[PDB]
Amino acid sequence: KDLVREKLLTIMNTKAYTQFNPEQLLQLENEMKIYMKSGDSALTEGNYFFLMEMLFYVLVYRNQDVDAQVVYNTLRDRLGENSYKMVIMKATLLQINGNDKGAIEYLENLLNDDLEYETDFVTYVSIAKKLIAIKTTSKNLSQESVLKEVVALTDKFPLDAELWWYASEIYFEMGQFEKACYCLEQVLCITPFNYACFGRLSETLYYEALRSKKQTKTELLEKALKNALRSVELSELYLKGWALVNIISRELGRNKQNDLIKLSASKLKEISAKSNNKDKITAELILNKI
Amino acid sequence: RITPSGQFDLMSPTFEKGKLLITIFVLLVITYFIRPSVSNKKLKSQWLI
C-alpha cells in the first residue's frame, strides 16, 4: 500500500518526526519496518537509504539503540563516513552511545578541514549547525548560543533560513519582540512563498502591540492585518492565518473589519468542517468561545 | 537469368547476419553492464546521502 510511502516521504521532507510525541513516534517506528520490508516495490534506492537513516534517527530518539548501531553498519557501505549526513549520524552515535562529549573535537578540526571546500558548502553549514547543537548542551544553557549563531551566521552564511528562524524563536521566547520582525522578514526574503512565516510575522506584531501605546497599537494591528492577509492570499484552509485575522478584526470591530469578521467566520467554519482532522478542535473553540 | 539493374528484390546470398547479431549482442551486454554503475554512482553521489 503506497499511501504509507506518501506519509513517510511527507514526514521525511518535512522532518515532522522531530516534533513527534513519544507515543506517535513509537507508532511511527513500529509501522515503518513492516512497509520497509514488505512494500519494497516502486521505491528507489535513494529513498531506501533515506528511510534507513530516518529509522536510525528514530531509534536514536527511542529508548533502545543497539539497532541504531546495526542500521548504521548497514548504511555505512555506500559513501562511507565522509558524507555530511554520515558525519552527523556518527557524531550523534558517539554522543549517545556513551554520553561522552568527545565527538565534538573530532568534529571541530573537521570543520577546520572543510574550509578548503573539499565538500559542498551545505555540508559544513550542517556541521556548524550540529556543533552549535552540541555546544549548547556542553554548556547547558545560555543566551550566548544566539551570539554563537550570529558569529557563525553573519560572516559565513546569511542565506540559510533555519538559523534566522531559530534566532527569531529565541528572541520571541523571552527576548525582544522587535528583532524577531527583522529575522522573520529575512526568512520571508529567502523563501518568497512561505505561508507560515507570515503567520509568525503577524503573531509577533500582535504580541508587540498588546504592550504598546494606543497609536502604536493601532499601527501594529494594522500591520498585523496587512501581513495576515498574505497568509490568506497564499492558502485557503490555513488555520492560523484565518484565526489571527478573525481575532484582530474582532478586537477592532470596525465596519469593514466587520465584513472581514463575517468572511473569516465563514472560512473558519469551513476549516472546522470535518474534512480537516484535529484542526477543527482549535478552530471551533476560538469560534464559539467569543 | 539476368538482372540488368542488380538484384534488389531478393536481398543477397552473402548477407552478414552473424556480424549484425554480434553488434546487437555487444550493445545489449554493454548497456546491461554499464547501467548499475551509472545508476548507483551518480544517483547516490549527487544527493550526498
Instruction: Please give the full DSSP string across A236-264, using - where no structure is assigned.
Output: SS-HHHHHHHHHHHHHH--HHHHHHHHHH
Q: Is A212 helix (H, G, I), strand (E, B) or coil?
A: coil
Closest residue of A to B39, CA-based? Answer: A45
Instruction: In whole angstroms, give the CA distance from residue A252 to residue A246.
Output: 10
- Residue carrying the nine cell digits 513492516: A34
Distance from CA of B48 to the nearest CA of A (A): 6
Among the partner residues B40, B45, B49, nearest to A50 by beta-carbon distance: B49
Contact predicate A88/A111, CB 8 Å: no
Confirm or reject contact between B11 and chain A (CB < 8 A). Answer: no
Instruction: Return the closest-CA partner of residue A280 out of A289, A290, A268, A263.
Output: A268
- Residue carrying the nine cell digits 470535518: A274
Among the partner residues A85, A119, A120, nearest to B49 by beta-carbon distance: A85
Contact predicate A18/B14, CB 8 Å: no
Beta carbons of B43 and A46 less than 8 Å apart: yes
What is the total count of domains within chain A? 1
H-type helices in chain B, by residue range? 17-46
Instruction: Return the closest-CA partner of residue A158 out of A137, A136, A175, A182.
Output: A182
Instruction: Return the closest-CA partner of residue A271 out of A286, A289, A284.
Output: A284
Give the CATH number for residue A15. 1.25.40.10
Q: Which long-range contacts (CB under 8 A, 24 or more apart) does A200-209 make?
A: A200/A168, A201/A227, A202/A227, A202/A228, A202/A231, A202/A241, A202/A244, A203/A240, A203/A244, A204/A168, A204/A172, A204/A177, A204/A180, A205/A181, A206/A244, A206/A247, A206/A248, A207/A172, A207/A177, A208/A177, A208/A178, A208/A181
Distance from CA of A2 to the nearest CA of B (A): 22
Instruction: In whole angstroms, give the CA distance from residue A205 to residue A211.
Output: 11
Beta carbons of B43 and A49 less than 8 Å apart: no
Residue environment code for A93-102, b if the CB has 16+ CB neighbours within 10 A, otherwise e: bbbeeeeeee
AA identity, residue B21? L
> What torsion do the CA atoms of A119, A9, A238, A206 make, to the nearest 10 degrees?
-40
Q: What is the CA radius of gyration of chain A?
A: 23
- Residue carrying the nine cell digits 553549514: A125
Distance from CA of A56 to the nearest CA of B (A): 13
| Residue A141 backbone zone (phi > 0: left; psi -120 to 50: alpha; other: beta) | beta
Confirm or reject contact between B42 and chain A (CB < 8 A). Answer: no
Domain that holds residue A13: 2-289
Contact predicate A237/A276, CB 8 Å: yes
Q: How was this structure determined?
A: cryo-EM
Q: Is the dihedral of CA A201, A203, A206, A211 positive or negative?
A: negative
Distance from CA of A283 to the nearest CA of B (A): 40
Q: Which residues of B touch A53 (CB under 8 A)?
A: 49
Beta carbons of B44 and A45 less than 8 Å apart: yes
- Residue carrying the nine cell digits 559565513: A156
**Number of Cβ pairs closer than 8 Å across A and B?**
28
Beta carbons of B44 and A79 less than 8 Å apart: yes
